[PDB]
Amino acid sequence: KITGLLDGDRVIVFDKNGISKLSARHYGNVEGNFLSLSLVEALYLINLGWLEVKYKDNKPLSFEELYEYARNVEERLCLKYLVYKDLRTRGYIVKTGLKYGADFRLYERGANIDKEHSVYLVKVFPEDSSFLLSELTGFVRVAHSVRKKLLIAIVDADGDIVYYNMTYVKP
Amino acid sequence: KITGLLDGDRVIVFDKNGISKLSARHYGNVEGNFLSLSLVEALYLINLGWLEVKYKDNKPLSFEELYEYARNVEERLCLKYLVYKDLRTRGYIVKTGLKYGADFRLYERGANIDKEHSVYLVKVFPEDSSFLLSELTGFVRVAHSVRKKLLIAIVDADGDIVYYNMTYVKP
Amino acid sequence: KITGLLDGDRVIVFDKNGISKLSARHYGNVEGNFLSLSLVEALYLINLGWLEVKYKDNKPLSFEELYEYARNVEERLCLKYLVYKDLRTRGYIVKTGLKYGADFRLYERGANIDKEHSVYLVKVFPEDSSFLLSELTGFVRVAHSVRKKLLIAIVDADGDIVYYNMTYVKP
Amino acid sequence: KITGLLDGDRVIVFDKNGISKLSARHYGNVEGNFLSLSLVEALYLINLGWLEVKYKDNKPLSFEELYEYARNVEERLCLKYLVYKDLRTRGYIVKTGLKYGADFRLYERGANIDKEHSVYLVKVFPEDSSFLLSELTGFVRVAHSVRKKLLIAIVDADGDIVYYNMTYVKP
Ligand SMILES: [Au+]
Ligand SMILES: [Au+]
Ligand SMILES: [Au+]
Ligand SMILES: [Au+]
């Protein structure tokens, strides 16, 4: 069970092999002799039984413990977490979509991250919260501007994720 | 210049010829003793310069006059008029989509609205407005069950339209 | 008295015991490491006396507290809560009807929702508010195509509910 | 061709046989020795080719002429006429719904007298006009109250008539 260190909004890994294992599956970003995982990533790794996270004492935090800490640091933690876990489970390599204002950005399944770029821009939405339609049309424009497809991930009232693809059309 | 009689939510045309001209291009409904147009159809034909609409006396009502009347009696006249005019201009035969909870239903440039079925289901939305996802989520469903393509026409504050498609997806 | 964590749009339950209890009576979603309830669900459970909810502090929110929070993050929280509580009380297993553009989808009290299909599709409305018929008209349609019974829940100003059915008719 | 005399909002038929034929199909009400027809009824009968209305000495009026008159007399003329004609065409004995707040009251298909009651109450609605939902629920109350079925007749944007039945439900 690889070990990581709770450092604010990130979790660091230094074990040489621990970092090699996680970099292979493409988790977090490698910065020198360290690997930086996001809080959602660490939670999912913990859930997978691969990662172990300690903060203060030598006693590693529990999923609940890390959740309690992250919910007060990250925003929409549960929203991003449920969906991230889903996509990871669907076989996707999920990476931040921050650069495009999106929640995530994904590579095709089975994509060679080496030569391939990301294809989907993902934006998560809770079913029961209304918002400006321009919020959506805006993402369709950004996605399109970067030759990427927009993926709307809805977390319905039942806690399940429903995905929709939205695009421009010329009747 | 075909003249019509504004009566509530529709315009009545008695001129046997105007009834042929309009019916030819699929505008309005031929009751037999007359042909009746919707307020949006009337506004459009006035705009084309084909129609003249009288209300209580003889002096025909200006486009803006008829337009103000319709805005007052029909909630989303602005939206519907705008998208209808646009799709009618693209050559589509624009009919009501009420049976499907939609704004319009379209038929290709030349089609016998009789033995043929509509190919598109259309829903109009002002862009700068808040909305709930179920409004779109239900539309995609209905379009699906009735095996028809869908168009989500979004009109921005400037009155411009951008059509979008939306499809359910399992990543 | 199970205790959950208010986290945006949902409530997280970590107690393996509450997870079993809630899961049994079909409440929330079991992510695996936790179970999450929707805001409407949590409100109902607080009201039922089964649950306790804590936000950014160890002091549980009162029903009126969580309720106000929810009212603020969800447009129609009032309507949906009222109808959810009522149908749940009647013994139905109330789930989301998002996929059909509806508020809820219902299963019989003795239904095995894993093997069975929902028998009702529900749409809620505030009685003393202006509406457009295409709002019911499309609902009737979807309900038909997906071969399900429908319920139009109409809540009056006092919050009292009356259910109505609607059927297409060819006289 | 039966003759009737325009009398305000009614068309009176005095002919002995004329009255006989119309009364057989159940048109108008029989008061004194004559037969009083409604403006929509008279318009329909003219459309049928059965009636000939004229204002006193003047030459008989054309469908357009009577409509021209009637429209500046009766309300929702086009609305009520479009539905009435349709229901009459479908083989129904369409009578007023006035005593119930409905537009029309219908008698089962076609063999009912005075010892036989009306089965439906009909309320016509133009598709693109919004109204308070309480208006609909009000008609369900009246219909139900008088042990009758409420028929919602919608004149859609295409000029066609769509019918829906609305009733109470106890889930
Ligand atoms: Au969440
Ligand atoms: Au407009
Ligand atoms: Au409430
Ligand atoms: Au009309």
Describe the structure.
The structure is a homotetramer of 171-residue chains. Chain A has 171 residues and is an alpha+beta fold. Chain A has two domains: 72-171, Trna Endonuclease, Chain: A, domain 1 (3-Layer(aba) Sandwich); 1-71, tRNA intron endonuclease, N-terminal domain (MutS, DNA mismatch repair protein, domain I). In chain A, 31% of the residues lie in helices and 32% in strands. Chain A contains five helices and twelve strands. Chain A has helices spanning 16-24, 39-48, 63-70, 77-89, 133-145; strands spanning 2-7, 10-13, 29-30, 35-38, 51-54, 60-61, 93-96, 104-107, 120-126, 131-132, 149-155, 161-169. In chain A, the strands form two sheets. Chain A has a six-stranded mixed sheet. In chain A, helix 2 (39-48) packs antiparallel against helix 3 (63-70) and helix 2 (39-48) packs across helix 4 (77-89). The longest helix of chain A has 13 residues, at 77-89. Chain A is globular. Chains in contact: A-B, A-C, B-C, B-D, C-D. At the A-B interface, strand 10, helix 5 and strand 12 of A face strand 8, strand 9, helix 5 and strand 11 of B. One gold ion binds next to helix 4 of chain B. Chains A, B, C, D: Homotetramer; although the tetramer contains four active sites, only two participate in the cleavage. Therefore, it should be considered as a dimer of dimers. Chains A, B, C, D: Its EC number is 4.6.1.16. Chains A, B, C, D: InterPro entries: tRNA_endonuc-like_dom_sf, tRNA_intron_Endo_cat-like_sf, tRNA_intron_Endonuc_cat-like, tRNA_intron_Endonuc_N, tRNA_intron_Endonuc_N_sf, tRNA_splic, tRNA_splic_arch_short. Chains A, B, C, D: Keywords: Lyase, tRNA processing. Chains A, B, C, D: It comes from Methanocaldococcus jannaschii (strain ATCC 43067 / DSM 2661 / JAL-1 / JCM 10045 / NBRC 100440) (Methanococcus jannaschii).
